[PDB]
């Protein structure tokens, strides 16, 4: 009654991408990510917080996305041993075996397998990642591989059929500097 | 606590999304859009307040982008005399009665509601044009023509010759800005 909402979408288009600002503590991160919906062409903002254990196993994830379609939330709990549940404590068996989350579009999440696995040069690991693509935030299990090439370079590969592969340049804490052609640290 | 910022290198076509809350004498809006040079997103929050004649009296802007936070606070007397939030006079904007914000069709409402044009009637205005994300205002010559109650011809008078026909609702709020904005 006090006010009335009016919403406008632009019809003009310009090329655009993501911008993410993250704050990192020892056992948790909080981030604000802004990016275009790649189907609709309209912007969204994703706010999220991740919390992990001493061994860099994910224990909690909270997401809040705002877009033209409305506000969507997601709350996930993980036991650090591959068992997931929602914020209501309902088990999510479809994610069994996932130890790490991978959020698109964010190169933050590549840090988890790096820090968790502690790979040596030349060592390869195949993982089951819980892949969550903004803005829809509908998680699904995804097979991935990481190979340590040297201290600052990791070979990332999709294992589900795309054959996508990339070499990540990371810093001494395992944070991505360059995700070549996809993300740059500012 | 360590701060980390990443820019995307991938590109996808994008545009503005604006959600505005309107009251009798003021509006507060949240506008998200891409920077048209950098490819990176920004968010503009703004609030406008006007008198009963639809003359702008105050405007406050807050933009967040990869370049940082930028703020702008304008005061107008409704008679074409402007000041910043600290009271310092802004002679460069002398004679402006209306603000025009890009990218927003909201601000087309001001001349429509203020001018009281008859059907077929054209008026030139001096608009204070404020383009996000930089928010560096400048006076600009524009013209409005009432075609009928629900259609106004907009003209840029600075030399582009850009013209548009705006479809508006019963309160002068833009429904269609053809090829630029659509009401959802």
Residue numbers in the entry:
A (entry chain A): 2 to 187
B (entry chain B): 4 to 187
Paper text:
The crystal structure of PA1994 from Pseudomonas aeruginosa, a member of the Pfam PF06475 family classified as a domain of unknown function (DUF1089), reveals a novel fold comprising a 15-stranded β-sheet wrapped around a single α-helix that assembles into a tight dimeric arrangement. The remote structural similarity to lipoprotein localization factors, in addition to the presence of an acidic pocket that is conserved in DUF1089 homologs, phospholipid-binding and sugar-binding proteins, indicate a role for PA1994 and the DUF1089 family in glycolipid metabolism. Genome-context analysis lends further support to the involvement of this family of proteins in glycolipid metabolism and indicates possible activation of DUF1089 homologs under conditions of bacterial cell-wall stress or host–pathogen interactions. The PA1994 gene of Pseudomonas aeruginosa, an opportunistic human pathogen, encodes a protein with a molecular weight of 21.6 kDa (residues 1–187) and a calculated isoelectric point of 4.9.
The final model includes 370 residues (residues 2–187 of chain A and residues 4–187 of chain B), nine ethylene glycol molecules, two MPD molecules and 367 water molecules in the asymmetric unit. The two outliers, Pro106 in chains A and B, are actually found in a cis conformation in both chains and have clear electron density. PA1994 can be viewed as consisting of two subdomains: the first half of the β-sheet (β1′, β3–β8) and helix H1 (residues 1–98) compose the first domain, which packs against the other subdomain consisting of the second half of the β-sheet (β9–β15) and helix H2 (residues 99–187). An analysis of PA1994 using the CastP server revealed a deep pocket (15 × 6 × 7 Å) enclosed mainly by helix H2 and strand β7, with additional contributions made by strands β10–β12 and the loop between strands β14 and β15. However, the binding pocket is hydrophobic in LolA, whereas the PA1994 pocket is acidic, suggesting a more hydrophilic ligand. The entrance to the pocket in PA1994 forms a long and narrow groove (20 × 7 Å) composed of strictly or highly conserved hydrophobic residues (Ile102, Pro106, Pro108, Phe165, Leu170 and Ile178) and also involves the dimerization interface (Trp13), suggesting a hydrophobic component of the ligand and the likely requirement of dimerization for binding. Analytical size-exclusion chromatography in combination with static light scattering indicates that PA1994 is a dimer in solution. The extensive dimerization interface observed in the structure, in addition to the SEC/SLS data, suggest that a dimer is likely to be the bio­logically relevant oligomeric state of PA1994. The swapped β-strands appear to participate in stabilizing the conserved cavity.
